[PDB]
C-alpha cells in the first residue's frame, strides 16, 4: 500500500534525524568546554540540565594522519563503492528512459489525435484541456468530451387525430430523429440549438394559453385543435413503418427550427 | 564539439480648421 510506503519513508528519514541531531549535541557540549562562548546554547534543555558545565577534554597527536596515509586501502574501497553506485544509477537510468519513452508514445499519440483534432473556432482552456461548447466540458482519451445520456435530447413533434367516438385522439404522425473534433462540435451545436428552441417555445406559449396551447411538462407542449392535436417534445433516445402525418410532423419540425434562425 | 506615419494632432487640426 502507498500509505504504508510513506510510513516506511518517514521511519527512515526519522532515523537520519535522530543520528545527526545527536552529533550536534555532543559537539555542543564539547565546545561548551572553552568556546562556546555561546556555543552551549545549542544543547537540548534536558541534556543541558543533566550535565554540569565543563565536560570532556582533548589530547595532542600528529601521525594519526600519517597512519591513515600509510594505509591506502580506504581509497580502493572508495573507488569500488563509487563504481557500484554508478552501476545502480545506470540501471535506474535505463528504466527512466523506457518509461519516458512509452509516456512520450501515448502523449504524442494524444497530440496527434489532437493535430487531427480539427478547427480554429472553439475556445479551449486548461492539467487537461476543456472546450466551451455553450458550461464547459473536458477532452479525454477513441476520443470524447465529458460534460456535467444525462441531458442529450432532441425534439420531435407528433400529430394526433381526433375520431368519430369524439372522446379522444390517436397518433397519426411523427417526425423522425436521425443519427472528429468538429463532429463533436456539430453535435454539441445541434444540441444547444434545440434546447434553445424548446426554451423559447415554452416562453411564447405563455401568451397562447387561451388559444388551445397548453404547456404540460417542462419538456412538452400540446397544441389542441378541433380535429387534431400537436405534441412538441424534447426527449432523449432511450424513451420510445411510415404513416399519414409523418410528412407534416417533419415539416412542422423544420419550420420550427427555421423560425428560431430568423429570430437569430 | 559543441557551441555555447503622420501626426494625429495635425490630421485632426486639418479636419477642424482646414490647415495643412
Amino acid at each position: 500500500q502507498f500509505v504504508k510506503r510513506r510510513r516506511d519513508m518517514l521511519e527512515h528519514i526519522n532515523l537520519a534525524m535522530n543520528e545527526s541531531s545527536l552529533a550536534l549535541e555532543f559537539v555542543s557540549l564539547l565546545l561548551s568546554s572553552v568556546k562556546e562562548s555561546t556555543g552551549m546554547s545549542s544543547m537540548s534543555p534536558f541534556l543541558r540540565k543533566v550535565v554540569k558545565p565543563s565536560s570532556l577534554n582533548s589530547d595532542k597527536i600528529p601521525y594519526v594522519a600519517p597512519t591513515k596515509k600509510e594505509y591506502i586501502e580506504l581509497d580502493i574501497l572508495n573507488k569500488g563503492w563509487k563504481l557500484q553506485s554508478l552501476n545502480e544509477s545506470k540501471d535506474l537510468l535505463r528504466a527512466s528512459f523506457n518509461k519516458l519513452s512509452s509516456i512520450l508514445q501515448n502523449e504524442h499519440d494524444y497530440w496527434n489525435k489532437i493535430m487531427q483534432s480539427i478547427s480554429n473556432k472553439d475556445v479551449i482552456f486548461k492539467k487537461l484541456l476543456a472546450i466551451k461548447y455553450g458550461d464547459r466540458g473536458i477532452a479525454n482519451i477513441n476520443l470524447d468530451l465529458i460534460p456535467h445520456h444525462s441531458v442529450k435530447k432532441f425534439l420531435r413533434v407528433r400529430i394526433f387525430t381526433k375520431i368519430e367516438s369524439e372522446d379522444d385522439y390517436i397518433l397519426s404522425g411523427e417526425s423522425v430523429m436521425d443519427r472528429d473534433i468538429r463532429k463533436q462540435i456539430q453535435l454539441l451545436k445541434k444540441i444547444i440549438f434545440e434546447k434553445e428552441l424548446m426554451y423559447q417555445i415554452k416562453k411564447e406559449c405563455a401568451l397562447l394559453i387561451s388559444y388551445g396551447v397548453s404547456i404540460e411538462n417542462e419538456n412538452k407542449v400540446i397544441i389542441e385543435l378541433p380535429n387534431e392535436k400537436f405534441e412538441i417534445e424534447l426527449l432523449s433516445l432511450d424513451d420510445d413503418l411510415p404513416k399519414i402525418n409523418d410528412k407534416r410532423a417533419n415539416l412542422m419540425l423544420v419550420m420550427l427550427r427555421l423560425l428560431l434562425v430568423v429570430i437569430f | 564539439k559543441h557551441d555555447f506615419p503622420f501626426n494625429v494632432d495635425d490630421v485632426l487640426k486639418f479636419t477642424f480648421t482646414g490647415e495643412k
Partner: protein, 232 residues
C-alpha cells in the same frame, strides 16, 4: 451632445493585424463606410460685431455639413471588381439631407483621461425655393464654403456604445485630393453622451479599451487646440 474620445494611428502595414485584433476583441468583422464633410465659415466680405442682443461676446465658428455617398462614387476602373470589404481601403432640384454641426473646443483640464467635446447638431432634410442648393442656404445664413474632405474607413460596434473607426482622410480640391492620412490610418474610439455618472462610466469604457490595447496600439487624448474650429 458630449463626445468622449481617444485617438491613435497605424501605418498601412499595420492594417491586417489591427483588423484581426479588433475583430477578435469586439466579436464582429469591420463595416465599410464613408462621409463627405464640407466646412463653412462666416463670410469675410460681410462683417458683423461679435456680440449678443444682450451685448455678450460670441465667438465666430465654422459650421460642418456632413453626409454619406454611395460607395460606387469612390470606386474607379482599376478598383473595379475588388471585394467590397475592409481590404479595399489598402488600394487607396432640392438639397440632400445633411448633418449640420458646430463643435466647441474640448473641455479644459490637465491629466484628462479622455477628450470631451460638446457638439451642437441639427439635421437638414430638404429645401425649396429660388436658391435651394445647400450652398445658397449656407450663404443665406451668412456663411461661405471654406474647405471639404472625404473620409473612408471601417467601423466596429462594441459594448456600451463604444465605436471604433479606422479612417483615411482626403481633402478635395480641383487641384486634386491629397491624403491627409498618407501613410496609414487615423484610429478613433468614441462614445456619444446625451448625468456625471454616465460620463464617468463612459470614461471607464474608453479607459478599458485603451488598457486592452496597451502594448499593441496606443490611444491618447489629442491636443485641445487641434480640435478647435473657431475662426480667427
Amino acid at each position: 451632445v458630449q463626445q468622449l474620445s481617444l485617438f491613435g494611428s497605424i501605418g498601412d502595414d499595420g492594417y491586417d493585424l489591427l483588423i484581426s485584433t479588433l475583430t477578435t476583441i469586439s466579436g464582429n468583422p469591420p463595416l465599410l463606410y464613408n462621409s463627405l464633410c464640407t466646412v463653412w465659415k462666416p463670410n469675410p466680405s460681410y462683417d458683423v460685431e461679435n456680440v449678443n442682443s444682450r451685448n455678450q461676446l460670441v465667438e465666430p465658428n465654422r459650421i460642418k455639413l456632413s453626409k454619406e455617398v454611395p460607395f460606387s462614387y469612390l470606386i474607379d476602373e482599376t478598383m473595379m471588381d475588388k471585394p467590397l470589404n475592409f481590404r479595399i481601403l489598402k488600394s487607396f432640384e432640392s438639397c440632400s439631407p445633411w448633418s449640420l454641426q458646430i463643435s466647441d473646443i474640448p473641455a479644459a483640464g490637465n491629466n484628462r483621461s479622455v477628450s470631451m467635446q460638446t457638439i451642437a447638431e441639427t439635421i437638414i432634410l430638404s429645401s425649396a425655393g429660388k436658391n435651394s442648393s445647400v450652398s445658397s442656404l449656407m450663404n443665406g445664413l451668412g456663411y461661405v464654403f471654406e474647405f471639404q474632405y472625404l473620409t473612408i474607413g471601417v467601423k466596429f460596434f462594441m459594448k456600451h456604445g463604444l465605436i471604433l473607426e479606422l479612417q483615411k482622410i482626403w481633402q478635395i480640391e480641383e487641384a486634386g485630393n491629397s491624403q491627409i492620412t498618407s501613410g496609414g490610418f487615423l484610429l478613433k474610439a468614441y462614445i456619444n453622451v446625451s448625468d456625471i455618472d454616465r460620463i464617468n462610466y463612459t470614461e471607464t469604457a474608453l479607459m478599458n479599451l485603451k488598457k486592452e490595447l496597451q502594448g499593441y496600439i496606443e490611444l491618447s487624448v489629442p491636443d485641445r487646440q487641434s480640435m478647435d474650429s473657431r475662426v480667427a
